Structure 1
């Protein structure tokens, strides 16, 4: 699978000695595409509908893990494309994000940790993988630090999370439902949920946007994919309260944001609250896979849209986060009308307007929670969707205003690869529903 690919890539980069830090990224991208093709062929030829255990009894490989691996393939190919190919061949976008060999090594380590989280069958492998991912996130954030308080807060958050994980490991080693519940909240706290999210939204706000596009997506996918695959907290009141509170905070608290990346972090919190409701349910593989795939596509699409929008502003706050406030996108329809159309498609998918993928994901979640006797959380989900739609429509309203300003550097060659990838994501969001019956049948036969 990808585990071998990641370790081979780490070995290659560790002893590469290449002067350019983007040629190695492009080689990594080509390798990832080739390994995706090879692994898909291998799975559909010799690994369909099987659950293998590799090494000892620590790493599991099943259909769920394979599909999460494909999702990581797709996201990682997109992110490597963003890293390798400068969107414009100008100084601004070159200084916007400059990868370094340490950064590639750290990203590969983080991806390996997330994969081990997904493929974990034993609590030892779990412990190791989560600590590896947390250390990778802390180091990646510490590489780019423009403030002292932010660095201290990130360090304290990582230390507290590690201490909590160590305490959970010691408690489970001493030995039952209480231990599993404590582990569940310990894992859930690391992706950002209502009573402890503030630090993660702060870190996302104070991070380079081309780092934020990664660090806001992979941990959620990994943790929620491990949690869903290993059903240990079902019909839990604690998870119910946490999910309801996370939805309420992400929706109502998202209305109070004027910074674009704070708003995106709160949207991610709300979307995690949506998926965290699926932990209360039986037979939640298809719904969770659908929602995580569509959410990953929408997250990548909106982050690419914001990155594209950087070229149409007459000033830059700082080289790492050129756009900070939402009003910097006022009248963006008069600079690139189709970029605003794509952003409208993405936000309407986030709201859950048919026939976009977000609507189908939310409908799957809602049907699952209704057909098993949960009615209050259905109303909670609907109200949260409306309140989130409020600030999504705010972003639209700001971005479709009137702007008469003349822009310096109006023309330059937009990267063909990045624009094509963004268009592909938008078209996926727009017309993936035509493949819904095929997806359902494929999941019924192969993944079950």
Structure 2
């Protein structure tokens, strides 16, 4: 369904004008919507945690992969709606959010790479999917190359990801040299006990986790997120993280790892404290993503963590999309635009937003409280599942670090709300232009999901218990 979309897009975009980009992106938006709503019945293949191997043991298929797959389509639909649909029908918003001719094709190829990462069963398939995603994401980062701020980020991301992919390939080839194999099916309890292949898996996890940017290799991706266009940043900071973390969770190669635990604690501390030292919105959200990545990395130290990870990644994806879309909507209520690519930079520019759109500030307050973990929002429940999982395995110091990190992060989360509920006497230079109904509906749906998804907690728990056991 994705390969056919990619081929059809190359063919159709080849023979189309530049003005047809919005229409093509809308067409793919409804195409993916129909793919989800019409082919969703494939979840019947995974009753009682039934697992399949596809393409000569090169791919794995179970309920976990299916759910991550559907979540990636939902995120792709939201992000592509952000490109096809025009927020405001005026020339300025025309200029800021204008998709490139190849952006949708690169987006779909990156989705394909992420899915192949999630579904990988062999190191050859894993490396090929990693390279596909990496090259696609480099091209996504570089496709807006009319600024040196974006150009330096593109070049840095290319080089750092090249080093990381080389390290991943080196680890995979060391594993092959040790075992003369390219799959995890040759690893059993006896295999792990008899031979010391732990360091190979530690190196592989290191290379994979550095691609999403855990400490002490966080600064480069934070700079990249700061400097890329915000409609690009919303995508490049979610999908690769989801793919890498899902592959790491399903691989289950870091049980009670000291190195992984220490790096997770370092990631949490760096994300929490460094967020306090931020005056830019993009850097603040980058450190927020770092803290969430540390939270999810804490789940890599124990088994039977599928439910907690799935719940947390879904709620975090929804909250991430919601917060970036709130930041996008707030662009209309500022008197000047920083760059063509990043129109808002500093948190101080959101000052007094409650006097321009009080319900936008209400939605932002809901999403920020969910980030902090205020009940009964989804973020609190995800953090609670993480706490239950870590206390079931006896990680008490990890739990204390988690609680302290959340308390520290609450300060710079409430920084946003405190700035936004201030008073701005400077009235707007713009008035009464109507915001897009489709994008507003999507943002409101995300906010309502965050607010009232705790209704279906028992239903989701039962579905997990029947479809994952």
Output the CA distance in 2 between the equivalents of 1:424 and 1:386. Answer: 28
Q: For residue 157 of structure 1, report the CA deviation from its aligned partner.
A: 3.8
SS at match of 2:21: coil
Normalized against structure 1, the TM-score is what? 0.95
**Structure 1 residues 149, 403: CA separation in 2 closer, same or farther (over 3 Å shift)?**
closer
Deviates more, 1:182-191 or 1:124-133: 124-133
Quote how far apart the aligned CAs of 1:307 are: 0.3
Shift of 1:404: 2.0
2-side partners of 1:99 and 1:47: how far apart?
41
Q: CA RMSD in A?
A: 1.9
Distance apart, 1:146 and its partner CA: 4.9
- Report the Cα offset of residue 121 of structure 1: 0.8
- CA contact under 8 A between 1:2 and 1:35: conserved in structure 2? no
**Helix, strand or coil at the partner of 2:18:** coil
Secondary structure of 1:53's aligned partner: strand
Per mean C-alpha deviation after superposition, the further-off stretch among 38-47 and 385-394 is 38-47
Question: How big is each residue's C-alpha offset from its partner over 1:420-446, in whole Å with a ceiling of 9 and x where there is no partner?
Answer: 110010010001001000000001112
Which segment drifts farther, 286-295 or 114-123? 114-123
Deviation track 1:253-277 (CA, whole Å, cap 9, x = no partner) reads: 0000001111111101111110010
Q: Match for residue 331 of structure 2?
A: 310
Residues 212-258 of structure 1: CA deviation (Å, up to 9, x unaligned): 11111001100000100110111000000110000000000000000
**Count of paired positions:** 447
CA deviation profile, 1:62-115 (whole Å, cap 9, x unmatched): 100000011011111111111100011011111112112221121111111111
- Which deviations, in whole Å up to 9, do the C-alpha atoms of 1:150-196 show, x marking residues without a partner? 5345424422332332343234324x211111000000000011111
Q: Alpha-carbon deviation of 1:47?
A: 7.4
- 1:46, distance to aligned residue in structure 2 (A): 8.2
Match of 1:391 in 2: 412
Structure 1: give runs of 5+ residues left out of the alignment: none
- SS in structure 1 at match of 2:60: strand
Shift in Å at residue 55 of structure 1?
Answer: 1.8
Q: Given the superposition, is the C-alpha separation of residues 223 and 10 from structure 1 closer, same or farther in structure 2, using an over 3 Å criterion?
A: farther
Task: Normalising by structure 2, report the TM-score.
Answer: 0.91
Is the 2:47–2:467 contact (alpha carbons within 8 Å) kept by the matching residues of 1? no
Q: 1:12 Cα shift? A: 5.4
Residues 367-415 of structure 1 show CA distances to partners (whole Å, capped at 9, x for unaligned) of: 1101111000100000000111000111110000011221122111211
Distance 1:340 1:184, change over 3 A: same
Corresponding residue of 2:444? 423
1:51: how far off? 1.9
SS of the counterpart of 2:10? helix
Question: Would the alpha carbon gap of residues 440 and 47 (structure 1) be closer, same or farther in structure 2, given more than 3 Å must change?
Answer: closer
Distance in 1 separating the partners of 2:255 and 2:10: 38
Does the CA-based 8 Å contact 1:255-1:390 persist in structure 2? yes
CA 1:56–1:300: 2 relative to 1, 3 Å: same
